[PDB]
Design an enzyme around this catalytic site. Structure first.
Site, PDB file in Angstrom:
ATOM      1  N   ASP A  12      62.088 -42.967 -66.464  1.00 17.06           N
ATOM      2  CA  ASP A  12      61.939 -42.958 -67.924  1.00 17.06           C
ATOM      3  C   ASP A  12      61.224 -41.728 -68.480  1.00 17.06           C
ATOM      4  OD1 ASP A  12      61.928 -43.869 -70.629  1.00 17.06           O
ATOM      5  OD2 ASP A  12      59.920 -44.723 -70.323  1.00 17.06           O
ATOM      6  N   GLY A  18      50.897 -47.318 -74.990  1.00 20.45           N
ATOM      7  CA  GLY A  18      51.687 -46.918 -73.840  1.00 20.45           C
ATOM      8  C   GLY A  18      52.934 -47.772 -73.722  1.00 20.45           C
TER       9      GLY A  18
HETATM   10  O1  LIG Z   1      47.963 -38.688 -73.705  1.00 22.71           O
HETATM   11  C1  LIG Z   1      47.171 -37.810 -73.395  1.00 22.71           C
HETATM   12  C2  LIG Z   1      46.822 -36.685 -74.407  1.00 22.71           C
HETATM   13  C3  LIG Z   1      46.227 -37.230 -75.676  1.00 22.71           C
HETATM   14  C4  LIG Z   1      44.861 -37.013 -75.918  1.00 22.71           C
HETATM   15  C5  LIG Z   1      44.251 -37.502 -77.074  1.00 22.71           C
HETATM   16  C6  LIG Z   1      44.980 -38.227 -78.035  1.00 22.71           C
HETATM   17  N1  LIG Z   1      44.305 -38.689 -79.193  1.00 22.71           N
HETATM   18  C7  LIG Z   1      43.104 -39.593 -79.027  1.00 22.71           C
HETATM   19  C8  LIG Z   1      42.558 -40.233 -80.342  1.00 22.71           C
HETATM   20  C9  LIG Z   1      42.726 -39.277 -81.540  1.00 22.71           C
HETATM   21  C10 LIG Z   1      44.226 -39.007 -81.730  1.00 22.71           C
HETATM   22  C11 LIG Z   1      44.776 -38.213 -80.523  1.00 22.71           C
HETATM   23  C12 LIG Z   1      46.387 -38.470 -77.822  1.00 22.71           C
HETATM   24  C13 LIG Z   1      47.015 -37.962 -76.623  1.00 22.71           C
HETATM   25  N2  LIG Z   1      46.535 -37.652 -72.193  1.00 22.71           N
HETATM   26  C14 LIG Z   1      46.547 -38.392 -70.899  1.00 22.71           C
HETATM   27  N3  LIG Z   1      45.833 -38.093 -69.815  1.00 22.71           N
HETATM   28  N4  LIG Z   1      46.088 -38.957 -68.804  1.00 22.71           N
HETATM   29  C15 LIG Z   1      47.007 -39.906 -69.153  1.00 22.71           C
HETATM   30  C16 LIG Z   1      47.585 -40.983 -68.487  1.00 22.71           C
HETATM   31  C17 LIG Z   1      48.537 -41.783 -69.159  1.00 22.71           C
HETATM   32  C18 LIG Z   1      48.907 -41.490 -70.520  1.00 22.71           C
HETATM   33  N5  LIG Z   1      49.846 -42.284 -71.144  1.00 22.71           N
HETATM   34  C19 LIG Z   1      49.735 -42.838 -72.495  1.00 22.71           C
HETATM   35  C20 LIG Z   1      51.028 -43.676 -72.782  1.00 22.71           C
HETATM   36  C21 LIG Z   1      52.155 -43.234 -71.848  1.00 22.71           C
HETATM   37  S1  LIG Z   1      51.215 -42.715 -70.427  1.00 22.71           S
HETATM   38  O2  LIG Z   1      51.840 -41.499 -69.790  1.00 22.71           O
HETATM   39  O3  LIG Z   1      50.767 -43.863 -69.572  1.00 22.71           O
HETATM   40  C22 LIG Z   1      48.306 -40.388 -71.198  1.00 22.71           C
HETATM   41  C23 LIG Z   1      47.358 -39.578 -70.553  1.00 22.71           C
END
Ligand SMILES: O=C(Cc1ccc(N2CCCCC2)cc1)Nc1n[nH]c2ccc(N3CCCS3(=O)=O)cc12
Length: 279
Positions: A119, A13
């Protein structure tokens, strides 16, 4: 905190690592962000109240020995990954319009509460199988690497920028969904600013009153002519190009707000289609 069972690493993140996790108690699946100044604490506690169907809900805040854990609702995919997946075919306009409409409602809500995202980018716009898109990491900047979506006023050193910076970022994202290529892929602050200048024209006092008085403005900036807007996002229709240009106005005070944007004719025929995700 021991109530959580890390399921896997979602990704690096902006403020720390984010894990997909399971609440051993409730069994609920959530997103864990491993991020402390008490000022930040009061700031993110305020974000708990900022609830909207288009804003990723912050379920809880856990503070324990310099360790700061934020628990968010989990969505299976982000907009960046979805764009790459439909890069050869392209996201149907109906879906692009639905997504833009939803984000604008989300921004309209935050902005009415004087909360800026600051952002916005494809990676923090989350989607689900139901055709919903949500803003993630909202307010976290105020509390505590890509420059492609950064508004020009921020780049020019404005220290008290407004809600218009989010409209600008969303405008860049909107253009990106349409063309399937980032609008301004800057790889340095000056390269980001100059790419903007080359497309929209070097801003001056005529179109942006007070621009030459901005902190990092330099009279030595090259003077590029504004390019025909039909070369920036073809083949988006005129309603779309019209809305986009208003989202990209140089003067933050003239830039269309989220609320007004929701009334633009482009959304006259807006619907809520569903995307096909391969989770
Ligand atoms: O991301 C995702 C989708 C996602 C799901 C699985 C993988 N995967 C899992 C492992 C296998 C490969 C794909 C990669 C991305 N979902 C989120 N739900 N709630 C969140 C809250 C914060 C964030 N953030 C992450 C960084 C910026 S953020 O907006 O704080 C993401 C989610």
């Amino acid at each position: 905190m021991e109530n959580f069972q890390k399921v896997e690493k979602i990704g690096e993140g902006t403020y720390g690592v984010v894990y997909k996790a399971r609440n051993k108690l409730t069994g609920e699946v959530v997103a864990l962000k491993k991020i402390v100044p008490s000022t930040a604490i009061r700031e993110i506690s305020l974000l708990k109240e900022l609830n909207h169907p288009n804003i990723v809900k912050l379920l809880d805040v856990i503070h324990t020995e310099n360790k700061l854990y934020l628990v968010f609702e989990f969505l299976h995919q982000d907009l960046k990954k979805f764009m790459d997946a439909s890069a050869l075919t392209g996201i149907p306009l109906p879906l692009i319009k639905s997504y833009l409409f939803q984000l604008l409602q989300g921004l309209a809500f935050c902005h009415s509460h004087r909360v800026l995202h600051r952002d916005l980018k494809p990676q923090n716009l989350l989607i689900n199988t139901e055709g919903a898109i949500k803003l993630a990491d909202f307010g976290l900047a105020r509390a505590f690497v890509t420059l492609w979506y950064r508004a020009p006023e921020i780049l020019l050193g404005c220290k008290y920028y407004s809600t218009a910076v989010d409209i600008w970022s969303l405008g860049c994202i909107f253009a990106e969904m349409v063309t399937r290529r980032a609008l301004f892929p800057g790889d340095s602050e000056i390269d980001q600013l100059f790419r903007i200048f080359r497309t929209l024209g070097t801003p001056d006092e005529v179109v942006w009153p007070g621009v030459t008085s901005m902190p990092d403005y330099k009279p030595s900036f090259p003077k590029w002519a504004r390019q025909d807007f039909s070369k920036v996002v073809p083949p988006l229709d005129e309603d779309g190009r019209s809305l986009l240009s208003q989202m990209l106005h140089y003067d933050p005070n003239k830039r269309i707000s989220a609320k007004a944007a929701l009334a633009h004719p482009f959304f006259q025929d807006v619907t809520k289609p569903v995307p096909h995700l391969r989770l």
